[PDB]
């Protein structure tokens, strides 16, 4: 298949080849903080990310992905709303065509400039990410909002690479990536049950979205828009926007770890 974010193949078109697009636990959503319920039973996040787990950065045509070696248990998320160990798999980012929008999740009617997703899978129960992606408790994604601010020394590692992966399919070695340090200093979070925000749109994600944004400069974020959604030797299209609109909550509870 050949989904994307352009006029012919974008989010409104996804339902055509992925009927779960209209499902009851679709992501992303609006977080309306006046409707969030603090839940004292939610636990703190327990995070370990080995900077040597990071292997490769590539252009999928839908974002950049930092792939981590997920055959080993070096990089694991536990706690939060999660039962068991969730192995780190991959990091990517969503943004919009300009800095005033671009996050997937929206807070109190407001879009951030971009949103970082840290993809993990239940390695207690499932033999691989591919099997875990089909189960309600299979995935956990940590979301971090990016707002325009000062230049981010931690994102600069990624931005420095983006020219070498400008075309879809291109990849480049990427390691010693201190992912933890990219996180905001508060790990307070909202959580709800949801889906992949991209086709196949599987309802297998425990969303964990951190309240506190991190900064990125205008010039840093603009580098992501210089990525192509098209391959070398193909007609060019810039990956100007790669975010899905908020989906109906359909009676799900968004809970907060904090008050
Ligand atoms: C073999 C295989 C299967 C699947 C379901 N995805 C992939 S690559 C896509 C991928 O890992 C991915 C992309 C986007 C998201 S999101 N925006 O965080 O909900 C997630 Cl959870 C996974 N590969
Ligand atoms: Zn994502």
CA distances from 10 to 5, 115, 184, 195, 199 (A): 4, 18, 31, 17, 10
Active-site residue, from 8, 62, 120, 243: 62
What is the torsional sign of CA 15, 19, 24, 28? negative
**Structural biology method used:** X-ray
List the beta strands (DSSP E) in the chain. Answer: 30-31, 37-38, 45-48, 54-59, 64-68, 76-79, 86-95, 106-107, 114-122, 139-148, 171-173, 189-194, 205-210, 214-216, 255-256
Ion ligand 2 neighbours, Cβ < 5 Å: 117
243 given a catalytic annotation: no
- Structural domain boundaries enclosing 66: 1-259
Sign of CA dihedral 170, 221, 151, 142: negative
We report the CATH number of the domain holding residue 183 as: 3.10.200.10
Q: Which atom of ligand 1 is nearest to the CA of 195?
A: 19
> What is the rounded distance in angstroms from the CA atom of residue 184 to the CA atom of residue 211?
9
Q: Tally the domains of the chain.
A: 1
Measured between alpha carbons, how far apart are the two ends of the chain, in Å? 44
Residue 26 Cβ inside 6 Å of ligand 1? The answer reads no
Angle made by CA atoms 92, 20, 88, in degrees to the nearest 5 = 30
**Both tokens assigned to 106:** 């929206």
- Residue 37 burial class via C-beta count within 10 angstroms: exposed 0-12, middle 13-18, buried 19 and up: exposed
Phi and psi for 71 in degrees, rounded to 5?
-90, -25
């Amino acid at each position: 298949l050949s989904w994307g974010y352009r006029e012919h193949n974008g989010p409104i078109h996804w339902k055509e080849f992925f009927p779960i697009a209209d499902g009851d636990q679709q992501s992303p959503i609006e977080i309306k903080t006046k409707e969030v319920k603090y839940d004292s039973s939610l636990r703190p996040l327990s995070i370990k990310y080995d900077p040597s787990s990071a292997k490769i950065i590539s252009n999928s045509g839908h974002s950049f992905n930092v792939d981590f070696d997920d055959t080993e248990n070096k990089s694991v998320l536990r706690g939060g709303p999660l039962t068991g160990s969730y192995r780190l798999r991959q990091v990517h980012l969503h943004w919009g065509s300009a800095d005033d929008h671009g996050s997937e999740h929206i807070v109190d009617g407001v879009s951030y400039a971009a949103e970082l997703h840290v993809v993990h899978w239940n390695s207690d129960k499932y033999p691989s990410f591919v099997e875990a992606a089909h189960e309600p408790d299979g995935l956990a994604v940590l979301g971090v909002f990016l707002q325009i601010g000062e230049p981010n020394s931690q994102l600069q590692k990624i931005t420095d690479t983006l020219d070498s992966i400008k075309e879809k399919g291109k990849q480049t070695r990427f390691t010693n990536f201190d992912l933890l340090s990219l996180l905001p200093p508060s790990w307070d979070y909202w959580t709800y049950p949801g889906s992949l925000t991209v086709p196949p749109l599987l309802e297998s994600v425990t969303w964990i979205v951190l309240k506190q944004p991190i900064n990125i400069s205008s010039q840093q974020l603009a580098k992501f828009r210089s990525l192509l959604c098209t391959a070398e030797g193909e007609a060019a299209a810039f990956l100007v926007s790669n975010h899905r609109p908020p989906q109906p909550l359909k009676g799900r509870k968004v809970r907060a770890s904090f008050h």
